[PDB]
Design an enzyme around this catalytic site. Sequence first.
Site, PDB file in Angstrom:
ATOM      1  N   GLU A   1      -3.460  38.948 -28.494  1.00 14.00           N
ATOM      2  CA  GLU A   1      -2.269  39.139 -29.296  1.00 14.00           C
ATOM      3  C   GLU A   1      -2.228  40.559 -29.888  1.00 14.00           C
ATOM      4  O   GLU A   1      -3.185  41.384 -29.804  1.00 14.00           O
ATOM      5  CB  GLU A   1      -2.199  38.074 -30.385  1.00 14.00           C
TER       6      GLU A   1
ATOM      7  N   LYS B   1      12.834  37.357 -43.917  1.00 13.09           N
ATOM      8  CA  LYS B   1      12.303  37.367 -42.538  1.00 13.09           C
ATOM      9  C   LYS B   1      11.878  38.749 -42.064  1.00 13.09           C
ATOM     10  O   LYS B   1      10.913  38.827 -41.307  1.00 13.09           O
ATOM     11  CB  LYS B   1      13.334  36.744 -41.600  1.00 13.09           C
TER      12      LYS B   1
ATOM     13  N   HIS C   1      14.276  33.552 -34.970  1.00 13.06           N
ATOM     14  CA  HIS C   1      15.593  33.018 -34.646  1.00 13.06           C
ATOM     15  C   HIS C   1      15.538  32.028 -33.509  1.00 13.06           C
ATOM     16  O   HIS C   1      16.341  31.055 -33.506  1.00 13.06           O
ATOM     17  CB  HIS C   1      16.578  34.160 -34.366  1.00 13.06           C
TER      18      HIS C   1
ATOM     19  N   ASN D   1      21.460  34.346 -29.746  1.00 17.67           N
ATOM     20  CA  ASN D   1      20.319  35.171 -30.100  1.00 17.67           C
ATOM     21  C   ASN D   1      19.578  35.617 -28.831  1.00 17.67           C
ATOM     22  O   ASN D   1      19.373  34.853 -27.910  1.00 17.67           O
ATOM     23  CB  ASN D   1      19.375  34.383 -31.004  1.00 17.67           C
TER      24      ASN D   1
ATOM     25  N   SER E   1      15.854  37.448 -28.073  1.00 20.57           N
ATOM     26  CA  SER E   1      14.591  37.805 -28.709  1.00 20.57           C
ATOM     27  C   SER E   1      13.448  37.727 -27.700  1.00 20.57           C
ATOM     28  O   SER E   1      13.480  37.035 -26.750  1.00 20.57           O
ATOM     29  CB  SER E   1      14.278  36.921 -29.872  1.00 20.57           C
ATOM     30  N   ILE E   2      12.382  38.478 -28.028  1.00 17.41           N
ATOM     31  CA  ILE E   2      11.120  38.349 -27.324  1.00 17.41           C
ATOM     32  C   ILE E   2      10.205  37.336 -28.024  1.00 17.41           C
ATOM     33  O   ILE E   2       9.957  37.449 -29.217  1.00 17.41           O
ATOM     34  CB  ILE E   2      10.378  39.690 -27.203  1.00 17.41           C
TER      35      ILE E   2
ATOM     36  N   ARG F   1       6.505  35.110 -26.477  1.00 24.04           N
ATOM     37  CA  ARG F   1       5.687  34.950 -25.297  1.00 24.04           C
ATOM     38  C   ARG F   1       5.877  33.577 -24.680  1.00 24.04           C
ATOM     39  O   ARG F   1       6.153  32.583 -25.357  1.00 24.04           O
ATOM     40  CB  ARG F   1       4.191  35.133 -25.660  1.00 24.04           C
TER      41      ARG F   1
HETATM   42  C1  LIG Z   1       7.871  43.510 -28.533  1.00 26.82           C
HETATM   43  C2  LIG Z   1       7.294  42.117 -28.578  1.00 26.82           C
HETATM   44  C3  LIG Z   1       7.707  41.256 -29.602  1.00 26.82           C
HETATM   45  C4  LIG Z   1       7.068  40.022 -29.752  1.00 26.82           C
HETATM   46  C5  LIG Z   1       6.117  39.575 -28.866  1.00 26.82           C
HETATM   47  C6  LIG Z   1       5.718  40.426 -27.764  1.00 26.82           C
HETATM   48  C7  LIG Z   1       6.325  41.703 -27.648  1.00 26.82           C
HETATM   49  C8  LIG Z   1       6.030  42.651 -26.507  1.00 26.82           C
HETATM   50  C9  LIG Z   1       4.647  39.820 -26.864  1.00 26.82           C
HETATM   51  C10 LIG Z   1       3.869  40.736 -25.910  1.00 26.82           C
HETATM   52  C11 LIG Z   1       5.290  38.749 -25.980  1.00 26.82           C
HETATM   53  C12 LIG Z   1       3.579  39.205 -27.797  1.00 26.82           C
HETATM   54  C13 LIG Z   1       4.102  38.095 -28.670  1.00 26.82           C
HETATM   55  C14 LIG Z   1       3.356  37.914 -29.969  1.00 26.82           C
HETATM   56  C15 LIG Z   1       1.944  37.963 -30.010  1.00 26.82           C
HETATM   57  O1  LIG Z   1       1.389  38.911 -30.701  1.00 26.82           O
HETATM   58  O2  LIG Z   1       1.326  37.115 -29.260  1.00 26.82           O
HETATM   59  C16 LIG Z   1       4.353  37.677 -30.883  1.00 26.82           C
HETATM   60  C17 LIG Z   1       4.260  37.580 -32.338  1.00 26.82           C
HETATM   61  C18 LIG Z   1       4.427  38.729 -33.058  1.00 26.82           C
HETATM   62  C19 LIG Z   1       4.800  38.709 -34.363  1.00 26.82           C
HETATM   63  C20 LIG Z   1       4.991  37.520 -34.971  1.00 26.82           C
HETATM   64  C21 LIG Z   1       4.844  36.313 -34.308  1.00 26.82           C
HETATM   65  C22 LIG Z   1       4.457  36.349 -32.989  1.00 26.82           C
HETATM   66  C23 LIG Z   1       5.909  37.434 -30.027  1.00 26.82           C
HETATM   67  C24 LIG Z   1       5.907  36.007 -29.788  1.00 26.82           C
HETATM   68  O3  LIG Z   1       5.271  35.484 -28.903  1.00 26.82           O
HETATM   69  N1  LIG Z   1       6.555  35.229 -30.729  1.00 26.82           N
HETATM   70  C25 LIG Z   1       7.371  35.743 -31.658  1.00 26.82           C
HETATM   71  O4  LIG Z   1       7.922  34.933 -32.450  1.00 26.82           O
HETATM   72  N2  LIG Z   1       7.642  37.057 -31.773  1.00 26.82           N
HETATM   73  C26 LIG Z   1       7.023  37.869 -30.874  1.00 26.82           C
HETATM   74  N3  LIG Z   1       7.452  39.187 -30.865  1.00 26.82           N
HETATM   75  C27 LIG Z   1       8.261  39.699 -32.007  1.00 26.82           C
HETATM   76  C28 LIG Z   1       9.686  39.325 -31.996  1.00 26.82           C
HETATM   77  O5  LIG Z   1      10.322  39.782 -30.786  1.00 26.82           O
HETATM   78  C29 LIG Z   1      10.434  39.931 -33.177  1.00 26.82           C
HETATM   79  O6  LIG Z   1       9.861  39.365 -34.369  1.00 26.82           O
HETATM   80  C30 LIG Z   1      11.948  39.752 -33.196  1.00 26.82           C
HETATM   81  O7  LIG Z   1      12.437  40.145 -34.462  1.00 26.82           O
HETATM   82  C31 LIG Z   1      12.379  38.336 -32.847  1.00 26.82           C
HETATM   83  O8  LIG Z   1      13.814  38.290 -32.698  1.00 26.82           O
HETATM   84  P1  LIG Z   1      14.709  37.493 -33.777  1.00 26.82           P
HETATM   85  O9  LIG Z   1      16.046  37.431 -33.075  1.00 26.82           O
HETATM   86  O10 LIG Z   1      14.070  36.143 -34.042  1.00 26.82           O
HETATM   87  O11 LIG Z   1      14.767  38.373 -34.998  1.00 26.82           O
HETATM   88  N4  LIG Z   1       5.545  38.306 -29.021  1.00 26.82           N
HETATM   89  K   LIG Z   2      16.131  40.114 -32.167  1.00 24.30           K
HETATM   90 MN   LIG Z   3      18.087  37.563 -33.878  1.00 19.22          MN
END
Ligand SMILES: Cc1cc2c3c(c1C)C(C)(C)C[C@H]1C(C(=O)O)=C(c4ccccc4)[C@]4(C(=O)NC(=O)N=C4N2C[C@H](O)[C@H](O)[C@H](O)COP(=O)(O)O)N31
Ligand SMILES: [K+]
Ligand SMILES: [Mn+2]
Lengths: 500, 500
Positions: free
Chosen positions: A279, A388, A188, A165, A167-168, A170
């Site tokens: 946030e 989800k 994930h 996986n 993913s973003i 923080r």
């Molecule tokens: C574009 C972007 C994105 C994001 C983020 C960011 C950015 C720039 C920052 C700047 C670093 C901020 C932060 C926050 C704050 O606002 O602090 C957040 C929240 C948001 C809603 C909910 C709960 C938490 C984050 C953390 O920390 N945790 C988590 O958990 N997530 C998340 N995201 C979402 C994500 O990326 C999706 O959801 C996928 O879809 C994953 O992937 P998968 O593979 O598991 O599906 N972050």
């Molecule tokens: K993703």
């Molecule tokens: Mn994923």
Amino acid sequence: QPAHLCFRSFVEALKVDNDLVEINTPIDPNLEAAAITRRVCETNDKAPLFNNLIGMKNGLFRILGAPGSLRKSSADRYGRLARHLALPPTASMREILDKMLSASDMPPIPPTIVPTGPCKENSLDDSEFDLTELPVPLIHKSDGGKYIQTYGMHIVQSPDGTWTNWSIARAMVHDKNHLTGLVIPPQHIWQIHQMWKKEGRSDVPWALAFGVPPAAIMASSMPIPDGVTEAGYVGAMTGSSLELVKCDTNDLYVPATSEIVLEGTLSISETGPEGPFGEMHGYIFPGDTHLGAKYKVNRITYRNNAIMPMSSCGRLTDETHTMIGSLAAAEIRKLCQQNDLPITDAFAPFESQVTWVALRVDTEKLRAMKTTSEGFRKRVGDVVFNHKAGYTIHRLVLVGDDIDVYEGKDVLWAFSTRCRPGMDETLFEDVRGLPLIPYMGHGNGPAHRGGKVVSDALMPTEYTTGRNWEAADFNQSYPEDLKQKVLDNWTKMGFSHHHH
Amino acid sequence: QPAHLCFRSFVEALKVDNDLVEINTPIDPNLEAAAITRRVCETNDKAPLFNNLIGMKNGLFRILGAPGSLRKSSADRYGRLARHLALPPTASMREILDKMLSASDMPPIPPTIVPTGPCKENSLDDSEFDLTELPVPLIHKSDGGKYIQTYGMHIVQSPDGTWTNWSIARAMVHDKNHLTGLVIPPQHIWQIHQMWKKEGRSDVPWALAFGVPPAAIMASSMPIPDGVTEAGYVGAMTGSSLELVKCDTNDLYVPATSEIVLEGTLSISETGPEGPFGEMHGYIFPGDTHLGAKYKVNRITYRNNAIMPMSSCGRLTDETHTMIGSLAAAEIRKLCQQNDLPITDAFAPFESQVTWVALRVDTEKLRAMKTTSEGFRKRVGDVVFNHKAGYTIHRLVLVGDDIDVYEGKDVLWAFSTRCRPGMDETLFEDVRGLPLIPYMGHGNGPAHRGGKVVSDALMPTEYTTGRNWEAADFNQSYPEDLKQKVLDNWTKMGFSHHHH
Ligand SMILES: Cc1cc2c3c(c1C)C(C)(C)C[C@H]1C(C(=O)O)=C(c4ccccc4)[C@]4(C(=O)NC(=O)N=C4N2C[C@H](O)[C@H](O)[C@H](O)COP(=O)(O)O)N31
Ligand SMILES: [K+]
Ligand SMILES: [Mn+2]
Ligand SMILES: Cc1cc2c3c(c1C)C(C)(C)C[C@H]1C(C(=O)O)=C(c4ccccc4)[C@]4(C(=O)NC(=O)N=C4N2C[C@H](O)[C@H](O)[C@H](O)COP(=O)(O)O)N31
Ligand SMILES: [K+]
Ligand SMILES: [K+]
Ligand SMILES: [K+]
Ligand SMILES: [Mn+2]
């Protein structure tokens, strides 16, 4: 290499587009870089590139702010997103979301392992770096740490090796060799973490890559299905296998052109203070620190003249709106269609702080279903709020075919005029809620449960015989020949460019 | 005479302001004038003055569209409203609404009877006019009649003589000497009509004056209290007794400088087809004709070169938004204060199609009340939704002191982030509703009852100890000295006028 496949090339694309401001005088990562970036995001200005960051040493690091934020012009409003994806800079939202969904019915294109890449140009072992000595930004004045990680990709793999996986989420600096960050259900990174915790044998091998291929950070921000390896989805979307290099200290693979890579472990046992953070919904609760997941960093590798992307997130408009909201909406559109619901389009209006999604209904199909608002609302909300992809969304607004869901003014018009409060709504209290919304985690009810609603802005005849109104607007309440005459004589009479 | 006291002088003021387009070539009152006006309202352009209306005969009539609509610039956005009231064209909404409320704790200044005025320059008796031969506009293509009356003032008096009401209610031509129009509860024209019906002796003496003193059309659009004669309220607000002349055929009094005056009766027994009409919420339901009140016209008097004001109403933004919404909000602010509720400001966001009012709370006062959301919501909604001033409003949004209720974006932000759907709301089903809203009269429930809600966007600590967040915005999440440095260096670094 192309802009969508190489972050360094993306930065050059923004320059070529006259969408970059290079700032070569000293800028403080303590608030100043993020304040500039925040101003950019609130005014839809050019993205800032901080080439002279106070505290940058031995190449770590420059900062690019606002990588996925909006442009001022209407004609290329979403151009920075388009530049993540090899789309023309004039691409519509619909076209961007269709590109993001296109891989969902394609075979994956698995990545290609290469022996080296730019991300290996420099390295620092565990005796050579200290995260507290890097120019990590303080993004908001009340943040509980310096948030190094706002636009990189976490890489974790299931214990059995079958799902990797991206993913973003923080993360902030804890000490010289640790981060803390959010790892929360149903995300994930959390699902994978749980697999390792139940196995109980070791901490999770982890990498965090910053300045990844822009197409990959887009998929990193999208709730593609459980079990689906983002790299192969990006490969399919782009038509090209992504080139990855192996980490030095573990067997994960990172994009070859990553600007900066941290290698280490995500603990299955340890936590540390995390937050507060300003946030996506526009708030920080100073002092609200809570325990978060703890990451150990064993190695740093990086490009010469590495650039760290940064999201200075909060009030409109930044990556947490353009990417979180829109990409959730895309996945929800597809989910609804796969559940045989007559949804044509979905978008999270910015005006809602991306807490709503408007769902455009094919009302010819709805009429054939011979259903009612109560029944339909219930069916839609069950599909979306039990999945989800619906996690971040607390209000669904159903609208008919005359509404452009990508236009917030029109969504607000339809919601305010076609959905009777109470009667035309179904509340959902036994679904997962998004605790980060102030009315959830800092509100009057359970932080993690409920607070969701389906608001039906379909009119009664849209279920039966068809729309029975015309709008009282220029477009609908005047014949074509008259409208055209008015437009043709407009400047002649004394009244007041697409690109702008 | 001043612009706020004489419609002809108001038109000159708009010219001087570079806020008028004079159209001296022939324009068709069948849709063309209203289409132009509609375009003006949707684009915030200059107000159109149609000096050459196809069908104008013997001085009846020119048309001014968009008399109370918005200007394009932010700095004089509400200047046309300010010009109704002798305020500077840069006046804020707050200043306009305060001016409209100022007479509420002043002695009335009763009107002065004068022997003649410009409205007597020409006359047509019952053998000399035919309403079907005047250049009455067709405003929307599906309207059920030609709506002569969109911006004049109905004048009716209680049987006992003690209350003379001035108000706006639509009316259309029925035949050569009759109109039909809306006369509905709880409006004062309806309340007075009911008094005459119960007396049972005669039809209601009536006059309809078009192109009245602008300060008087403002009060005509405001829900000032039952029993209060608008003329004396306007006198107090303006500091001057309004000059009125007696009708020729009855003993009502009309503004001396009225452009056009119809004299006759409002029937206590007869009705006729009325509507459909493209209404304030942005819709027309073609074919939805219903029976309306019936007016008989016995006499027309008018100024040389008379001008009829016209509202081409519908989707944003026109007089039905700027005046109905805002003036209802003003009266609601005062009502709440008079009921000991800690409300400082109120506004109907345009984004809500003026169906919401946002109420700004003095949260220091709220804290001292030692109350809860449930209790407070209930108290506010009972006060407002049981009163005529709340008639048009279906959602109240309570916000704390950091929100500028005159800024829709900020209202939408607070509503979307601080009010948990369901839990933080109280529904009101046993209150009068506004049937004209599509979800009411053309919706799933009772047309005239319910469909109202109080949405509490106050956070929990606003009731207890005080606000416990900072916004994640430029203003609040950076220190003053840094913000100023950023602003001072903005153009130097490469980033991008009040009047615009
Ligand atoms: C574009 C972007 C994105 C994001 C983020 C960011 C950015 C720039 C920052 C700047 C670093 C901020 C932060 C926050 C704050 O606002 O602090 C957040 C929240 C948001 C809603 C909910 C709960 C938490 C984050 C953390 O920390 N945790 C988590 O958990 N997530 C998340 N995201 C979402 C994500 O990326 C999706 O959801 C996928 O879809 C994953 O992937 P998968 O593979 O598991 O599906 N972050
Ligand atoms: K993703
Ligand atoms: Mn994923
Ligand atoms: C500004 C304006 C106003 C108005 C109007 C208009 C305008 C321009 C037009 C265009 C013509 C449109 C129409 C409509 C539509 O939309 O169609 C309407 C509706 C609205 C809501 C509701 C119901 C109806 C009117 C009618 O018709 N009816 C009535 O009833 N009313 C009304 N209004 C309101 C009023 O004026 C207030 O309310 C006061 O306040 C009165 O006074 P008192 O004295 O009683 O208090 N309208
Ligand atoms: K509905
Ligand atoms: K009135
Ligand atoms: K609340
Ligand atoms: Mn009245």
